[PDB]
Design a protein around this motif. Sequence first.
Motif, mmCIF file in Angstrom:
data_model
loop_
_atom_site.group_PDB
_atom_site.id
_atom_site.type_symbol
_atom_site.label_atom_id
_atom_site.label_comp_id
_atom_site.label_asym_id
_atom_site.label_seq_id
_atom_site.Cartn_x
_atom_site.Cartn_y
_atom_site.Cartn_z
ATOM 1 N N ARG A 115 52.037 42.257 49.224
ATOM 2 C CA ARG A 115 52.503 41.125 48.398
ATOM 3 C C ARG A 115 51.627 39.895 48.660
ATOM 4 N NH1 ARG A 115 57.939 41.137 45.615
ATOM 5 N NH2 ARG A 115 58.714 43.161 45.932
ATOM 6 N N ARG A 116 51.137 39.157 47.661
ATOM 7 C CA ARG A 116 51.286 39.244 46.189
ATOM 8 C C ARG A 116 52.742 39.105 45.686
ATOM 9 N NH1 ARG A 116 51.314 42.743 41.277
ATOM 10 N NH2 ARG A 116 49.973 41.709 39.843
ATOM 11 N N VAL A 117 53.130 37.849 45.421
ATOM 12 C CA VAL A 117 54.417 37.383 44.864
ATOM 13 C C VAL A 117 55.667 38.018 45.479
ATOM 14 C CG1 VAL A 117 53.701 36.012 42.867
ATOM 15 C CG2 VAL A 117 53.778 38.477 42.638
ATOM 16 N N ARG D 14 49.902 23.838 47.086
ATOM 17 C CA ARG D 14 49.099 24.576 46.092
ATOM 18 C C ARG D 14 48.204 23.610 45.310
ATOM 19 N NH1 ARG D 14 53.568 29.000 43.805
ATOM 20 N NH2 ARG D 14 52.893 30.737 44.955
ATOM 21 N N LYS D 17 45.721 27.611 42.854
ATOM 22 C CA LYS D 17 46.272 28.989 42.786
ATOM 23 C C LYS D 17 47.604 29.062 42.030
ATOM 24 C CE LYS D 17 43.933 30.367 47.036
ATOM 25 N NZ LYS D 17 44.123 30.799 48.426
ATOM 26 N N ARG D 18 47.912 30.254 41.500
ATOM 27 C CA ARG D 18 49.155 30.659 40.798
ATOM 28 C C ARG D 18 49.581 29.804 39.586
ATOM 29 N NH1 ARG D 18 50.243 35.776 40.533
ATOM 30 N NH2 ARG D 18 52.051 34.887 39.552
ATOM 31 N N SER D 19 48.760 28.894 39.058
ATOM 32 C CA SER D 19 49.180 27.985 37.963
ATOM 33 C C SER D 19 48.153 27.773 36.840
ATOM 34 C CB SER D 19 49.595 26.644 38.551
ATOM 35 O OG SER D 19 48.524 26.116 39.294
ATOM 36 N N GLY D 24 50.199 32.594 37.576
ATOM 37 C CA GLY D 24 51.327 32.297 36.676
ATOM 38 C C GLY D 24 51.114 31.010 35.870
ATOM 39 N N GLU D 28 49.630 34.394 31.420
ATOM 40 C CA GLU D 28 50.556 35.393 31.961
ATOM 41 C C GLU D 28 50.169 36.809 31.530
ATOM 42 O OE1 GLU D 28 54.572 33.552 31.096
ATOM 43 O OE2 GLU D 28 54.741 33.945 33.248
#
Lengths: 117, 55, 150, 51
Positions: A115-117, D14, D17-19, D24, D28
């Motif tokens: 994981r990875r989320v 952050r 990353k992730r945005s 995410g 998506e």
Amino acid sequence: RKQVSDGVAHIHASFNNTIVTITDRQGNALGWATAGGSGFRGSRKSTPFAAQVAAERCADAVKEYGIKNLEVMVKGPGPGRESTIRALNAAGFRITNITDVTPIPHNGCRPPKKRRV
Amino acid sequence: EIDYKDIATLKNYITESGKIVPSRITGTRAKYQRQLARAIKRARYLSLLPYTDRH
Amino acid sequence: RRRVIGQRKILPDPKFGSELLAKFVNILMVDGKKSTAESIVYSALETLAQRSGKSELEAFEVALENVRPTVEVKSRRVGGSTYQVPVEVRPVRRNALAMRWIVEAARKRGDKSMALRLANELSDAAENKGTAVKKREDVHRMAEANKAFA
Amino acid sequence: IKVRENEPFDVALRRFKRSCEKAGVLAEVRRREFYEKPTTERKRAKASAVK
RNA sequence: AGGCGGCCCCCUGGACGAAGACUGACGCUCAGGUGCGAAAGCGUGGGGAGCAAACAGGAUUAGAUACCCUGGUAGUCCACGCCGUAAACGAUGUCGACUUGGAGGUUGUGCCCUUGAGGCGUGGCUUCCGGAGCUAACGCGUUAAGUCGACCGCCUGGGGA
């Protein structure tokens, strides 16, 4: 031998292990340590965490050379290639510059398996 | 001016990682981008560029 | 899968309004009998005042703070074979474990009078030797090795 | 790869990353998708004013 | 067709264009013939850094002549010949003409202050969607599996082959 007060810190990261070696301009090591040699085995040896201990074990072997300021060189694609820079900065040193010899991302290799989320 | 063999012109079409830039900043009106991207690779063999920045 | 259930405050003590003492009797309660705990309550602190007991402002709350749990764990998994991880416990859990550690350390070998077996343990609760300390260090030697891959 | 920027410290936030792109929040990918939706929702329909 | 790839200077078939000119059906396909190779293999000698069937060991397992790891020969490469087989796949046999559309490229040529992030014509190519048509239904869709024609091979339930 005799103290030099300048050098380069080489971080070389493989998918199983991480090497941290400090060199002088004449082309030789002053101090070396590894993530495996820092007492790590298996899925622990291949962590960015075991690479942070290797900086302080290299700091214990470079003691004779009188170095406080050095520049960083990053090598290899492995998981230890970033986590140990700020740990070496905490081992009794100042980082003057950062450089790397990374290829542009086309080689791939090792999907995360975690994981990875 | 107007040719790729001069380094003060050539440096405007490449990056600090040795890569070629997108068409939106080459002035080729999106019609000579293919040929300019080859002229930049030809500059490596004219001793104007290294073949990769990492070496 | 979310527990987190209700809310339970419990009652304080009838003689001084203590919240810690009214909880400590719920650790010495066995067979649903609180009377056996009330034979040990105050008598352990008054028997400490036959050997070493100096100041009583907090009664035994600082003996429960010199006793220090740190080596609690949980199991992490994505399938079959699991991975151990250490946990940073809340003061309410740290206190709840310290209350068992000391009365279980006082029960370790058979002798007379639990108020006196506990007073012997409270006289040790200024330097903490053997019981409630020697197992802690022998498992704490993995406390960073069990953080390595998170 | 860039990131040659000399911060002696790891930051508790952050920043990259992730945005933004490859998920995410933006761009998506997977986590269940729908195929009649692009042939069902074309024009608003709400937002003027709900209030 | 298989496929073709660093750059530089060559050797060289094909295709495409503008204005002219010279032919005058010279247009299509083709029984049996006659010819192209990706990779691996052979015939004969060289060349040999990665890598790697076999070989040689280790691990795993009750076992492991396998997976995985550690070493490694043929081979990969060059000449002169052989092998002729593949998802050779876009699962789409081959020649032409006819056809409402959207969105994106590649390259000649004519006229324009290119006073236009080129534009309007005229030629040769090329990619993603989509409507008429096709069809067991999926799939094809102006580069069609559509439409109208010309030609050559094979199939007739499978196992057994």
